[model samples]
Target: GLVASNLNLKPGECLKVRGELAPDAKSFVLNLGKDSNNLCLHFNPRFNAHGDANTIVCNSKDDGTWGTEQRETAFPFQPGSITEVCITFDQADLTIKLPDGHEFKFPNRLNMEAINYMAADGDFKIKCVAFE
Candidate 1:
């Protein structure tokens, strides 16, 4: 069976995801937005394919259906380093924090946690996920 990569989320609050994804994978994904049809954040690598088994997905309507997000380039971080991510949605804006403390903000198209379905398409490590 595939390791559970999807997240059970609560909308309208900030979510912080801290851990590692696909240490050995070519690239992975961090999907955000509403449940079935919305897009906020999508990231991946340029080296490898998926993660452990070369397959991973995150869907709103269903549980897991989409393939690996290999379109985007991977964020370069030190190996064995734990990633620190913070997600904030305030009725209108969506914010993402990277490990380096840099933040990227966008419009909340899917209504801040309206769907709350997130996942990784590879062998990644998750240390902690919290909200503030």
Candidate 2:
């Protein structure tokens, strides 16, 4: 699962995350929040349980639900994968770009501000985090 902190971002700010996944991990999660624990959107990527595939997940916890309506994104979730996730918040939605040079969009729920902390759950090491 993904965890983020200091997520008090404005409407036009952006965060760029580039990293790789552990070669043998089953799943990966990306989350952002105001504090170090409270996450807004928890995006889980299923690389193993589904078998030899790549994906990006979008879900929310607004109505007490999680991982609702999982979609197959073009992001390459490979073994020992290295990818980049560029997240930008706006008045409408959140836009993201994957490692394989794919792009997508999702709703920017839990309006707070800046994203201070970010983490990964699955099978790899995160190289770095920066602003764009």
Candidate 3:
């Protein structure tokens, strides 16, 4: 099963997303945004797509125009397994802690204290996404 929904992450709060990747999942994406057309952060995990597997690509987009991609080779999520991802941010940077205890930082391009929208897509199931 696959689905996408809005997630509201408020200021001074943490966002936690727990889900499982479909056993045969090829790729998936987690996004925080102003809307569908503008994403403040694009967190993408590739499993063999773009001739790359086990890679994490981060980026931002404005008015549907993408910026330069930031790729990390320290891929942690595994297919057919449950995973938990936590995100916290301030005015300067967004901190992402991966399931394997790896932390990555991305610029807070939007410069907002909170994210108004979030969505997930591709071959996966979202168990829960909470803001607290």
Candidate 4:
């Protein structure tokens, strides 16, 4: 199922997402944003999509234009299993912690202090999403 809603993300707070990927999943995407057309962060995990499997791709979009993609190889997700993700950000960077205890940082290209929009899509079931 796909989800798109408002996220009251504040400074120093984190967006926690818990879900499980489908056994035959191809990819999933989580986006934090100021709007649908202007996202502060786009976190995508792909499984055998576009010739890249077992990889995480991060990027941002502004006015419907996408920024440079950042790829991470420290994949900690597996299909048909539960995964937890925590995302927090300041003005300059956003930090993501994966279920396998690996953490990574991505630049906050939009340079916004708070994100109020969130969107989730692709082949996964989201059990919960919260800000804390």
Per-candidate local distance difference test: 0.50, 0.64, 0.81, 0.87
RMSD to true structure for each model, in Å: 6.2, 3.1, 1.9, 1.1
Clashing pairs in 3: none
lDDT of 2 by residue, 6-100 (tens): 54566677888777777776777776655434455566777756554565567655434453554765656677667767777775666666666
Q: Which of the two, 1 or 4, has more lDDT?
A: 4
Q: Write the per-residue lDDT of candidate 4 for residues 16-61, one digit (tens) a residue.
A: 9998898988999898888888998998999879889999999999
| Alpha-carbon runs more than 4 Å astray in model 3 | 1-7
Cα deviation in Å at residue 28, candidate 1?
A: 1.4
Who is ahead in TM-score, 1 or 3?
3
Ranking by TM-score: 4, 3, 2, 1
Model 1 Cα displacement at 53 (Å)? Answer: 21
Candidate 1 colliding pairs: 20-125, 21-124, 22-123, 22-124, 26-48, 35-115, 45-74, 51-122, 51-123, 52-123
Highest lDDT against the true fold, candidate: 4
Superposed on all Cα atoms, model 1 deviates from the true structure by an RMSD in Å of 6.2
Best by TM-score: 4
- How far residue 97's Cα lies from its native spot in candidate 1, in Å, is 0.7
